[PDB]
Amino acid sequence: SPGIWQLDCTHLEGKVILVAVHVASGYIEAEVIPAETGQETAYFLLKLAGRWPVKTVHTDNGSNFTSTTVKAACWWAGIKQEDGIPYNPQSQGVIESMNKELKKIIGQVRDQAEHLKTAVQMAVFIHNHKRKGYSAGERIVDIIATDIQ
Amino acid sequence: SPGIWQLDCTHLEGKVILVAVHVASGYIEAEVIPAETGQETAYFLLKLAGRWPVKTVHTDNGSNFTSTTVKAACWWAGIKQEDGIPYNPQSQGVIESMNKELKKIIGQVRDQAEHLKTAVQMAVFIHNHKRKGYSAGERIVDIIATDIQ
Numbered sequence A, B: 001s002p003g004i005w006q007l008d009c010t011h012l013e014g015k016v017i018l019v020a021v022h023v024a025s026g027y028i029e030a031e032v033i034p035a036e037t038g039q040e041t042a043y044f045l046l047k048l049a050g051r052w053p054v055k056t057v058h059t060d061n062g063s064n065f066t067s068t069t070v071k072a073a074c075w076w077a078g079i080k081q082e083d084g085i086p087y088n089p090q091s092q093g094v095i096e097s098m099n100k101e102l103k104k105i106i107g108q109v110r111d112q113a114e115h116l117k118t119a120v121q122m123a124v125f126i127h128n129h130k131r132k133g134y135s136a137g138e139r140i141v142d143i144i145a146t147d148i149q
Ligand SMILES: C=CCN(Cc1ccccc1C(=O)NCc1ccco1)Cc1ccc2c(c1C(=O)O)OC[C@H](CCC(=O)O)O2
Pocket: A037, A039, A040, A041, A042, A043, A046, A069, A072, A073, A076, B111, B112, B113, B114, B115, B116, B117, B118, B119
């Protein structure tokens, strides 16, 4: 549980927003990329795993599951690369709702930045700090620290 | 001190590596940028503060301290922007040794990536996972979780 992440790709403004969600906490990281290539996904995972103890990644689609560049990054960073099949149907709904929430936040901040990438990072900030009462940022640190101890 | 970070800028291959160091743990995040502008620094801080509870940042130089774009990011993200004067002379030596370590790691991985940005992210990974026994990644989570609790 502490090491499980899910990839998620959503679109806005003719660009791609790549998201990684820490499943147990709902904490996220995200980036804007021109398109979702194996190379972009691989680089994103490399960044993520240098920052958090990523044990397992559920890939967002079959192309990223198949990609030898993505597999190479998972090999490099010591990540178990897994599919993203929603054996629990609740997963679909959670990701859908998260994408809707994120796009809402991006709209609320969109005029505070020229570039979409800035707006996305503002949305990451708001999402991770929002008290649901703990925030996702508090939950991920608590979950991981408890695991360490 | 769970919320204190230090900016650090170093150069390699005619490019700039911008680093943020969590002072109490030695955990780092870093990026490769063409040059160290206020906009680049502002965006980097926005990213960092969406990911960790950044209370205070000691800027790496007077230009980033002065920059109204950097001040705007610090205002947006609720970060106290401070100078980076090494009132404790040990700070100087710690950052210099860190830059030397990072450059050493980048050399050890340099042939595993075409692009410097990849090698830098590999170096971040190795640095944060290295047991010195706990790793910097373990220490930052423990420090912050203890603070929350
Ligand atoms: C598929 C070719 C790419 N190479 C293959 C390569 C070339 C030369 C030597 C070793 C390798 C190798 O396979 N290394 C092991 C490995 C793969 C992933 C992690 O470790 C690795 C790579 C991936 C993503 C990137 C990269 C680079 C890079 O070569 O630097 O560059 C930045 C780019 C940014 C995002 C974007 O622009 O899409 O993402």
